[PDB]
Design a protein around this ligand. Structure first.
Ligand SMILES: CC1=C(O)/C(=C\N=C(/Cc2ccc(O)c(F)c2)C(=O)O)C(COP(=O)(O)O)=CN1
Ligand SMILES: CC1=C(O)/C(=C\N=C(/Cc2ccc(O)c(F)c2)C(=O)O)C(COP(=O)(O)O)=CN1
Ligand SMILES: CC1=C(O)/C(=C\N=C(/Cc2ccc(O)c(F)c2)C(=O)O)C(COP(=O)(O)O)=CN1
Ligand SMILES: CC1=C(O)/C(=C\N=C(/Cc2ccc(O)c(F)c2)C(=O)O)C(COP(=O)(O)O)=CN1
Ligand SMILES: [K+]
Ligand SMILES: [K+]
Ligand SMILES: [K+]
Ligand SMILES: [K+]
Lengths: 456, 456, 456, 456
């Protein structure tokens, strides 16, 4: 069915409300035109991010009451460890408080200064941890991924030709690892095919190169494979997920996404020495290998949530609800990234605001504008997020200048999607009303989080 | 909006199975085609009743952690007490575990054997307690309420002329009280007007007669007054609620309906001496005046929920959600009781299954078909629920042969309403295929709960 | 060991505090010298009752998050039903919101007007439901049970000679049933031996008389059997519990005691017809046979709690903590009921206040006095509770005029017990300071709950 | 009181197994006689650490249901913010997932390579982050702190003469900051006086040097000031806390200690520019300025818990409970570090097991014996935790060969303290029977976590 109903009931609710346009206007100014700086109670439907904003189930809340809070040997850790071993198939697990905790560990463990890390497009925290540790990032995604309007399947795939080139021009020993993300967040939540995962494994293995996945949205990815990759139609999400990771040497994971929790993450690997070193390091930044900066109750919620994510009807509905928002927007002629990805609809800021150049930050501006007319919060995913080149000092110039309508799992309904789509269509009517922005405060890294702007 | 979006978002979800049609058919058979005998774990959308099946808020769940479990003098009781005094404007309140507990107390307190209790139709528990305490029931609802097709506003209103007639024929002193229900469940959830409540108060007061309300769905009732009664456009739900009860000497309430909880109710009154007698009685059946057979956490959740029920956007959506399901069914020509009430849609199974005789249990069979085709549980409200005649062994044969689609508050979405509507509308496009049922097991009493059937 | 440590850890806490003596004095006056009328937040350690005041475990709180709130077919009901079948061994179960709900059902089901019900001492609600339904109560406990200071084992036992006499003088057909309580609350929480249960079964069976247990404190009872009855020392609590009920035709149960919950109860029986009739009746007073006036989450907590009660270390500690309070009091010469029972220490009001007669209510007075000097709340269990004879109109005159220090399960520590014992010993120092009381308001039944007094 | 009763009662309990000695011996062996390798489910009383193992209140659990899970601008953050501003009096606050996260930020913000950080002894994570950022550590604690038997008040005080010496020898500009810990964990949980904090503030301020506090057990510290520092008799815990931090430029805190939570911490500072830099850094390691790697519910629980920690009766009992265990051990002649600290009792295993050499791991073996005999887990803080020398392969051989009995807040009773004390005192009456241990598995790093032993 095109748009299935929620494969669950509502157990408990929280109120939503909208403050007037004029109140929202004061608010957008006081946040320095950065949606990141608005306050939760001032937001009606909050599509800033699907990170940590998911609704847990009654089963997970039951596990929340059974937190075994021991510093060492918590039953919750054993339950997480066993679940991840079973479902992802890696030998070892190190819990971390969230994803960038596990990225800090991997980057410190796996990178020698001056080595290359090659990935299917960059992510902000991931790239920063690679570069802080002295790696050079190389984008090996296909060119097509960078074209917003181009509707092709598995836009997340690595270009094997580009991978071959890197191996030829630099030498295998100078490549720390391949970073393969599932889905690809900045491409619009685009999936990677199993075929691509296999071919990447085969080539890297022949040269002795390691492959570490970013598992953050691996279930959404597995959904796309089931739906769209020939041969996978009668496979279960869990089977698909276990095969995906069989082509990897380990993974980083933010549980705050596809594990259906509000906090939590982990690092997995197969290598014993790397496991031993990872435990030496987790102690510095996170906590004991037996809790990694998480309460026992959160290891428990995350163990239960990751297994709930395997239910076909859950993930089908998750992905199709996002698709519904995109379909409504597209039917009205609103320009979006296509095809719609697993977790968000990305409005194409370049087309929405054809009158601005990327230098007056159309994407930051539109996000503000949607808040002002709508009370819906959305996120900048363009030139601001891309940050500065640390060799030249200029803005990285992404081809994708996008505004992200990001959907938390199990929180909103199709009627909420309708409210969002209506507000956005009206704003489209007068797209030309959206003004250029300029920096008034710029952080030294990850600048999009707390940067502040003024109109040009 | 004809249909506003949910004025809340989802905090937590309730896991459901999603079993396919073929398994649902096995479950229905194991249940002897009686939806009352289905296991909850086997049902996707459970529309058996809106009683005690509501989703609580995060604030209510917070209060669930603050239960003061004292047997006497719990802080949660004082919170419940002042909330009800504030919102309903009654002087005194006695908590009960649910509605029929309050009804038990009222009927023992307020009836002398042989006296009459007149009301706008009746509900089974309410009327049961009236009769077992010696009252004669007299229906004083307007005749229009008995016409299930008549699309008229405030169909729950008492006919003042019938009340006048009762006064003149039996004498004021032989009338124990008037029992005014808001809304009227038996008529399909039909609201009573403020004008009618005032007229009833004025006539009864001149004769010294008491009026007690069944407040169970008073908040749905208040929404209808707000939406449709000239002059109440500028009034809040709370103002309407407080005015409604100013025309009463007291009430009984099942909190499991409009107080947005899973258990709880209470008895209110203004008379000091009745309050005293009520407290003497509550200890025999329920508990102390300050717990009434409720945990402290539940008095707290009900205090919080009743106040949440006053929010305009909440009750508006609650009622418009039910209306959406009714509207969609009606647009497809599916026969329903009209107008659609505050809490449920009733299918006219006599008309739906015209090819079957009432002796083939059309409503019981339609309810079975609906579950098989959709995973939706509904309640038979026809000849089966009517029971078998005490003395002759004939069926009691009611005019209403209906299936009730009863909607718990804040549990389902419009997409779930589409599951229900689409399934029923498909069944209706080939209704003649629906098969008659026969008893294979019939208990001597409460046959609707445990009887088993097979297809003719 | 004499005084074992708690066989659990503290998971969560609530603050306790004490308001000054003068504030307590105003308070005791405004409650009309009835501890029942004080407010929970004005009480420092609340020993009014062990009914519904117990601390639940983390496992039960986990079940509280998994309430299946369906009106029919709740998984929680199936879990309760199965647990009670397994542990108590009765065929059928009907949930009720609490104990007196199940007593209302049994008394209506099993008593013909003018029949006798014979019991091992009376309880207030139990006796009232017997008499409301037209039974005459006969006390068949041994004489020894009525002597407070007499330290003998299994003071709860029925006098078989007294039972034989009743059978001889009235005829078996005029005895509705034998009511056998475990433990015996008003005797001081006194256990009944297995031998006595067997002999009672054997004699009643030969005459065709039914035996229904009051199961409210059956686990405490089972503890005493394990500890003190020869042959039972190597049996498990669960084994002992299952044998106890094998000598009964059914039971009433307040779950609010030994099932470790804050609300809940049930009625059990073996007879099919009586089960069928009980379901007809529960619908009138409580709710459906599938929930009996309980939320699904409470059926779940009660199923889990009853099974936790079977843990030997739990019940051993439960009973020995009470014994510790009694041992400290006795070592200081404070007069108590002996031996100390399962749930409470009962101060002997007659000996504490030798200067008053029972007619100036020493027990009500002392309870007030302990509150005033201590902030510890305790309960009257003497002449006030015993009520009036409904043939003569005079006070029932119990030989046991007692003040109950009642211990909620898993809430307090030995240090709390020490605070209680110290305060009470000091009050003993000046026992003569405690004044006579007289009624100023007397309820028509169960008068102790909300009766109000003034000093003579 | 020498030992007050608990100023709370139990709301809920945590289930524990209660396995007998013979099974405990098997568990210890399966754990290779290393208590760090025990499963939590196998332990009765877990005194491994007071970090993150505290029992929350009912109010905290209520706040756990009110988590506003927004990625930015959560209401729970603003609550945490204003609570810390109010209670600590720092201008700015950045949340972190726990203490070492705050330490990571501080040391990156406040240290230039080659600079000195001087402090009253150190803690391992704290000093680690100082060194890895280029600092040289200098101990400026009073010499008395190094004498574990010396029974002296405020043993945590900095020696102003050592600080003066450092200033004159290295120059103020080469001192990054002074790190003042309250209490001092390494000295046995020894408190610092207000006089010392003021003297340190005055000297450092004259030279332009910053002072940052490790606030982890500041509330235990404040209790000692209240109890023992002349002039603080009339001051509340809150007044003492606020005055303490007025002598600092900021702090790092592990909320998992004195904020009564299971996870959480924060970084405070007064300097506007450092606050700005801190927010730029927090996003790399932890999360947004308004969540810092914490769920919203946890910022809420920590806001509520920190305020609960200010209650006099609570902290008084917390500290006197630890003191009770120390007093009892000392009265029996069991050798301990003196005076007993705010959070733990340390057994002198060198003296306890005089018959063993440090090479036979007396503390590791005593910790094993304690578990076997009582079901109590303790932490080795001796030669094993000291590690093996980087370059020579010799053991690092510490002066302190101790077993730490670390007490989580609000989890245990005096009866549990008796289990611990009685078990240790019995072991001590035949200490010579305690056997030396030898390595059977030794990892290359963090050997205390995973090493395995057998008896010599
Ligand atoms: C594919 C991947 C992610 O999407 C991701 C996080 N995602 C966020 C939160 C956030 C992160 C970076 C931003 O520029 C951003 F604006 C928002 C998000 O909204 O998308 C992390 C890191 O996981 P942590 O957030 O648990 O540390 C690793 N890998
Ligand atoms: C207007 C009114 C009610 O609707 C009502 C209950 N209503 C139910 C539950 C129900 C009750 C009895 C049945 O045979 C039945 F088949 C359905 C329902 O589905 O509609 C009560 C009684 O409130 P209690 O249920 O809290 O005691 C009082 N007044
Ligand atoms: C052996 C037995 C009980 O002890 C009992 C209750 N006990 C109470 C509460 C209460 C009851 C009667 C009083 O006079 C009294 F002052 C207090 C108590 O404190 O002891 C019930 C009834 O169970 P319900 O309370 O769940 O309905 C049945 N049987
Ligand atoms: C005075 C201070 C602490 O005591 C402390 C922690 N303390 C622990 C846990 C622990 C930590 C590391 C170990 O190798 C260890 F064996 C024990 C403890 O048991 O005492 C931290 C760090 O706070 P985080 O743990 O929230 O990051 C900062 N400052
Ligand atoms: K923890
Ligand atoms: K209670
Ligand atoms: K319910
Ligand atoms: K979150």
């Amino acid at each position: 069915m095109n748009y299935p109903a929620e494969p669950f009931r509502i157990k408990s609710v929280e109120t939503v409300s909208m403050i007037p346009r004029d109140e929202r206007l004061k608010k957008m100014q006081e946040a320095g035109y950065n949606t990141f700086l608005l306050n939760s109670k001032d937001i009606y439907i909050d599509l800033l991010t699907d990170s940590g904003t998911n609704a847990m189930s009654d089963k997970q809340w039951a596990g929340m009451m059974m937190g075994d809070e021991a510093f060492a040997g918590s039953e919750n850790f054993y339950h997480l460890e066993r679940t991840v071993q079973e479902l992802f198939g890696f030998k070892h697990i190190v819990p971390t408080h969230q994803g960038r905790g596990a990225e800090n560990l991997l980057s410190q463990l796996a990178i020698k200064p001056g080595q290359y890390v090659a990935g299917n497009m960059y992510f902000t925290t991931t790239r920063y941890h690679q570069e802080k540790n002295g790696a050079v990032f190389v984008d090996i995604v296909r060119d097509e991924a960078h074209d917003a309007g181009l509707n092709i399947a598995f836009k997340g795939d690595i270009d094997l030709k580009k991978l071959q080139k890197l191996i030829d021009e630099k030498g295998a020993e100078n490549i720390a690892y391949i970073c393969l993300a599932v889905t690809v967040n900045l491409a619009g939540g685009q999936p990677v095919s199993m075929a691509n995962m296999r071919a990447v494994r085969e080539l890297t293995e022949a040269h002795g190169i390691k492959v570490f996945y970013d598992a953050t949205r691996c279930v959404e990815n597995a959904y796309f494979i089931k739906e769209q990759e020939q041969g996978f139609e009668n496979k279960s999400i869990a089977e698909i997920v276990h095969e995906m990771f069989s082509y990897a040497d380990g993974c980083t994971m933010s549980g705050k996404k596809d594990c259906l929790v509000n906090i939590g993450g982990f690092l997995c690997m197969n290598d014993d020495e790397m496991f031993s070193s990872a435990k030496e390091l987790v102690v510095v930044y996170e906590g004991m290998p037996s809790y990694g900066g998480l309460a026992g109750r959160d290891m428990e919620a995350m163990a239960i949530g990751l297994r709930e994510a395997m239910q076909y009807e859950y993930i089908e509905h998750r992905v199709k609800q996002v698709r519904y928002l995109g379909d409504k927007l597209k039917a009205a002629g609103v320009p979006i990234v296509e095809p719609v990805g697993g977790h968000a609809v990305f409005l194409d800021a370049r087309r929405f605001c054809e009158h601005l150049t990327q230098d007056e930050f159309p994407a930051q501006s539109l996000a503000a504008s949607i808040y002002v007319e709508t009370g819906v919060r959305s996120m900048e995913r363009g030139i601001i997020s891309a940050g500065r080149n640390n060799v030249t000092g200029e803005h990285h110039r992404p081809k994708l200048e996008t505004v992200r309508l990001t959907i938390p799992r199990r929180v909103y309904t199709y009627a909420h999607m309708d409210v969002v789509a209506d507000g956005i269509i009206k704003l489209y009517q007068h797209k030309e009303d959206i003004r250029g922005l300029k920096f008034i405060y710029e952080p030294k890294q990850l600048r999009f989080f707390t940067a502040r702007f003024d109109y040009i």
